[model samples]
Target: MDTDSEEEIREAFRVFDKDGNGYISAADLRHVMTNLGEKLTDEEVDEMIREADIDGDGQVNYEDFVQMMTAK
Candidate 1:
């Protein structure tokens, strides 16, 4: 599924950053997933946070998001 480019992925990051604060909090992540019709469990969300949160800050910043997406 090579459907998204770097630009599209970054745009998605912005959409997920609901507060415009340049980070994706757990609530934001859950909310977006729900909107996409997947209600995630706490463990699933935590796993996502752990996966992309490079600084262990409990949130995903632009750098972390971009790095994770681009690494593929």
Candidate 2:
């Protein structure tokens, strides 16, 4: 990606990581999905969080966030 896109993404994700924990939680994710009028169950959220939580500490860090965002 170009530097401009990268900077935009970094800024965007910083905003998305509302808790400011250098990670993205289910709550953070739900806001976007819900804003798009998408319905997501708690179970589905937990499941996705599990897949994204590389540290296995009940949350997703920046690296994991990037991975999940790119992974098909």
Candidate 3:
């Protein structure tokens, strides 16, 4: 990731990492969408995490989030 986009991704990751723990859990993901008034199933959240989790950690970190968003 480039500097500007990486900075932007970091900011967005901060929003999802509500607990500021440096990673976004499935619960956190659901909570954020729920707060936005969007209902997301556990399967959907899992699928998203699965897609982005390059390290296979079962959650999204800043690097994973940026890769998921920026991938062609």
Candidate 4:
């Protein structure tokens, strides 16, 4: 991967890590999307997270998020 795209992903990841504890929760998605000025549906939220939550922890950590981001 190009350095800039990787850096961008790293930078983007920080916004969703609401509490800075290394994970983004359903709550984080709620607040982030609210700040994003868009309404996110429950099913969509679950879909997004479930797709990314490879470890089945009900949240997105940096590692899993990287997989989701880097996946083709």
Candidate 5:
């Protein structure tokens, strides 16, 4: 499953940062799942927020995203 190049992952982050707010919010999650063809549960999205929100800011930023990608 090593399909994502770092560049692609970075782009993924930008996809959610519509305003260049530098953070991924629930706003994008809605559009994200909708575009993906399946509306994931609140639990799923909540976990995602926790996953990259290492600082407990309730939002995922670029640094948080890179931390997740480090696992890739």
Candidate 6:
């Protein structure tokens, strides 16, 4: 987990928020993980997202992204 500042967190979220949708979707997770040589099943990915999605909106926003990364 990174002890990132607000700016770092925001920048990181922007990077992962592919398609510029202002949210991180399962596809975004898959794309990032695949590029990092980690492939997660759809269910596993969704579970991971849900665990960090504090808003419970079925998508991870910037705040959730910071929590997820730092919770590692």
> What is candidate 4's lDDT per residue for 1-72, written digit by digit as tens?
654354465556686566576777766654553443267786666565556666343566676556645654
Tens-digit per-residue lDDT, 1-72, candidate 6 = 955444565565587665666677656655554444366686765566556556343565666555555566
Runs with alpha carbons beyond 4 Å of true place in candidate 5: 1-3, 29-41, 55-57
- What pairs collide in candidate 5? none
Clashing pairs in 3: none
Is 4 or 6 the stronger prediction by TM-score? Answer: 4
Q: Per-residue lDDT for 5 in model 1?
A: 64
Q: Estimate each model's TM-score.
A: 0.54, 0.50, 0.44, 0.48, 0.50, 0.46
What's model 5's lDDT at 28? 63
Query: How far out, in Å, is residue 11 in model 1?
Result: 1.3
Model 6 bad stretches (over 4 Å): 1-12, 15-22, 25-30, 33-37, 55-57
lDDT of each: 0.64, 0.56, 0.58, 0.58, 0.60, 0.58
The model with the greatest lDDT is 1
Colliding pairs, model 4: none
C-alpha RMSD between model 6 and the true structure: 4.8
The sequence of per-residue lDDT tens digits that candidate 5 reaches over residues 1-72 is: 864455565666676677666677756644553444366777676666555566443555676566656674
lDDT measured at residue 60 in model 4 versus the true structure, 0 to 100:
62
lDDT of each residue in 1-72, candidate 3, tens digit only: 653343465565587666567788766655553443267776766565556666443575666555655653
Query: Can you rank all candidates by TM-score, best first?
Result: 1, 5, 2, 4, 6, 3
Residue-level lDDT of model 2, residues 34-59, one tens digit each, is: 44336878666656556666634455
Instruction: Tell me, by TM-score, which candidate is best.
Output: 1
